[PDB]
Each structure stands twice: as structure tokens, then as C-alpha cells.
Amino acid sequence: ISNDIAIDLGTANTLIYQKGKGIVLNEPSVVALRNVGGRKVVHAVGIEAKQMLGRTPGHMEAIRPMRDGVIADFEVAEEMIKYFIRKVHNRKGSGNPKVIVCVPSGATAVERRAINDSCLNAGARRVGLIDEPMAAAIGAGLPIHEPTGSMVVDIGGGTTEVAVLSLSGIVYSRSVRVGGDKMDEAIISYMRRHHNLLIGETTAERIKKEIGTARAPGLSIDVKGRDLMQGVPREVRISEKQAADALAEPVGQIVEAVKVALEATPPELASDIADKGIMLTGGGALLRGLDAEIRDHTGLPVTVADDPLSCVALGCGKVLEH
Ligand SMILES: Nc1ncnc2c1ncn2[C@@H]1O[C@H](COP(=O)(O)OP(=O)(O)O)[C@@H](O)[C@H]1O
Ligand SMILES: N=C(N)SCc1ccc(Cl)c(Cl)c1
Ligand SMILES: [Mg+2]
């Protein structure tokens, strides 16, 4: 029994894999803070904190400290990390925990040092950082040890990360701040402007999951929220076609990010990718029809990973075990 862990520190969700056990934590990357005196104290982390989004009293806030793929608040991020690490600790396990944390290509030296330090402050004896797209690829079952290039497109909350890998190494990587959050935000903007209804970010995510799609059909759901002009609560019906229209902008931006990456690919790797095509991972890959949109605009085969939300955690878990 071990306390060694591998951590997917996502913009929206954090997952921990524990050596010998598998994925033992999967919670929103959210911290709720309460004002006391002039100080902010940690009130909740993870599942409860996300439920507080859009629902806080004045003396509280709920924050996503990694929301845009950068560390927005080092102290809150460190509190989040230490909370999750402490939550999975097994008193029956060995000490001197080794901790692997997945790092997106664009993370800065300052951010990497901060994550290292948070892990040490949580009781880690050793901290290893591994490249996140390597983790995503391994978790998606890509044979990244082969010479032939593989492309992974990882659509998360706050970012989409594209990488080309070969022989166990990253050859190209690019990050854009378009992903699941931009999709939610487009649905929010759509509801405001077309239906005069103000909706919360959690409701927007629910709409995206239930009726969202990258391609117009159709079916309909009830959407409740705040009236734009007068403020009274009310509800409207929204269809798949409407949701498609809402999501078209961020979908197009994701497709463009994939095109930009492809365009940077040198000849031999382009040949490789022309054969194998593109692997989608991340929760954004669950958007109905996104694979088809990418295929259509690139002319390349597009596959959706098995269990796209868990690919990175599964991948670094594999690395942890070996
Ligand atoms: N069924 C779904 N359809 C579309 N998007 C989804 C679905 N399920 C989850 N998502 C989105 O995936 C994103 C989370 O992806 P994830 O890979 O966990 O991101 P991160 O690693 O950055 O935390 C969120 O924007 C979430 O709303
Ligand atoms: N994992 C993501 N793709 S976004 C959050 C994030 C940002 C910087 C670092 Cl070092 C880390 Cl470890 C994590
Ligand atoms: Mg991720």
C-alpha cells in the first residue's frame, strides 16, 4: 500500500491516481472562500465549491484558480492542491510520497516551481513533473513510443492543447484559450441576446451537455434563469439548432487551433498524421459532432479517445506504476 500519486491539475477538474489503486479522486478545481475580518479563509474545495458558483452570499466567493490554464492565485491554488492530496492520503500506506504532476506545455518556470512547492508543502518527498500531452496520449492508448508522429487535441475547460508526439517525446505543442468554458460562455451570451435571459455558468454547462452540438440538426429543453431587463425569474425553451448556433463561434475557434497546429507540421510528420489522423481527448471532446467538424475542415481521420475526461490521469498513472 502506497501513498504515491499522480495528479491531473485541470482548469476545471482535478483527478488523482494513486499507485496500486487507480483513480481515487475526481473533483472540480474550485475553491470557496469566506471573508472573516479582512482575511479570506478556505470554506470548501471541490464538489461543494462548484455548487456554490453563482450561488454565494456576499461574504463568500467561489473561485477556479486554474481557470484559464494559468495559476491565477498561487495561494488558492496551493490550498486546493494540498486539500486534494491530503484527502487521498492513506494512513496504512508507506510515507515519503512520490508525486507526479502533469504540466501543460505553456506552464512557466514560475508556475512549475509553485506546483512543485505546493506538493512538497502537502507532504511530498519527491515531485516529478511530466508533460501533460504525453500523459493525454498515453491515456488515450496512442503508441507514443513509435517513431511515427501522433497528434493529440485535448479540449479541456479553459484551454485546448494540441501536440504532436514521436518516440516518447513532444515535437510540437500549442495552447489556445478556447475550450469548454468558451462554449459555456457562448451559450450564456446566446441566451442573453436572443432570449433576454441571464443564465448562470453551471446552467450553461448543463445546457451544453444535454443539447449542445458542433453541427445543426431538433430536440428541446427548458432553460430557467433571470430576466434580462426586469430581473424576475422565468424560463424558455431552447432547441439543438439554437444550441448549435450558440456554439458555432467557439467550435470554429477550436477547429482553427487544430488547423494552425497542422499547418506547422514538417513533411515527414505531416505524412505520419495524414495516415493516422487526430486523437481527441478532454471533456470538450464529448461535444456532439466536434469530431466530425474537425474531420470536415482538416480532411483527416478524427477519433475520440475512450474516456476522454480521464485520459491524462490514466496516462500519468501508467507512468507512476513504471
Ligand atoms: N458531455 C459533454 N459535452 C460537452 N462538454 C463536456 C461534457 N462533459 C464535460 N464537458 C466539458 O469538458 C470540460 C472539462 O474537461 P476536462 O478535460 O476535465 O478539462 P480540464 O482538464 O481543463 O479540467 C468542461 O468545459 C465540461 O463542461
Ligand atoms: N493542467 C492544465 N492544462 S491547466 C492548470 C495548470 C497550469 C500550470 C501548471 Cl504548472 C499546472 Cl501543473 C496546471
Ligand atoms: Mg486537462
What are the DSSP calls for 17-38, one per residue?
EETTTEEEEEEES-EEEEEETT
| Ligand with the closest atom to the CA of 105 | 2
Q: How far is Cα 113 from Cα 129, in angstroms, rounded to an integer?
A: 10
Q: How far is Cα 282 from Cα 183, in angstroms, rounded to an integer?
A: 14
Q: What residues does 258 pair with on adjacent strands?
A: none
Residue 191 alpha carbon to ligand 2 centre in Å: 31
Determine the 3-state secondary structure of 308 from DSSP.
Answer: helix
Residue nearest to atom 8 of ligand 2 (CA): 107
CA distances from 108 to 71, 239, 259 (A): 10, 42, 25
DSSP class per residue in 73-91: -HHHHHHHHHHHHHHH--T
Residue nearest to atom 25 of ligand 1 (CA): 180
Determine the 3-state secondary structure of 318 from DSSP.
Answer: helix
224-228 own/partner pairs: CB under 8 Å, 24+ apart: 224/199, 225/191, 225/197, 225/198, 225/199, 225/200, 226/197, 226/198, 226/199, 227/196, 227/197, 227/198, 228/192, 228/196, 228/197, 228/198
The resolution in Å comes to: 1.5
Lateral strand order in the sheet of 220-227? 197-198, 220-227, 233-239
Residue 110 grid coordinates: 514560475
Q: How far is Cα 16 from Cα 131, in angstroms, rounded to an integer?
A: 16
Residues across the chain: 322
Q: How far is Cα 302 from Cα 295, in angstroms, rounded to an integer?
A: 6
Nearest atom in ligand 2 to 106's CA: 8
Number of Cβ within 10 Å of residue 35's Cβ equals 14
In the chain, domain spans: 1-140+309-322, 147-177+251-308, 179-250
What CATH number was assigned to the domain covering residues 1-140+309-322?
3.30.420.40
DSSP class per residue in 138-164: HHTT--TTSSS-EEEEEE-SS-EEEEE
Q: What DSSP state is assigned to residue 97?
A: -
Domain 1-140+309-322 matches domain 147-177+251-308 at the CATH topology level: yes
User: Which among 18, 79, 20 has a CA at the least distance from the CA of 45?
Assistant: 79
In CATH terms, the superfamily for domain 179-250 is ATPase, substrate binding domain, subdomain 4 (3.90.640.10)
> Where does the chain break, by residue before each gap (C–N > 2.5 Å)?
217
Q: What is the CATH T-level fold of the domain 147-177+251-308, as seen in this structure?
A: Nucleotidyltransferase; domain 5 (3.30.420)
Q: What interhelical angle do 74-88 and 109-121 show, nearest 10?
A: 40
User: Which among 108, 116, 109, 168 has a CA at the least distance from the CA of 7?
Assistant: 116
Q: What residues does 263 pair with on adjacent strands?
A: none
Q: How far is Cα 30 from Cα 126, in angstroms, rounded to an integer?
A: 25
Residue 114 alpha carbon to ligand 1 centre in Å: 25
Would you say the C-alpha torsion 166, 130, 178, 28 has a positive or negative sign?
A: positive
Q: What residues does 278 pair with on adjacent strands?
A: 151, 302
The residues lining ligand 2, judged by C-beta closer than 6 Å to any ligand atom, are 9-11, 66, 69-71, 101, 103-104, 107, 111-112, 115, 132, 156, 159
| Ligand with the closest atom to the CA of 156 | 1
Question: Determination technique for this PDB entry?
Answer: X-ray
Residue 282 alpha carbon to ligand 3 centre in Å: 6
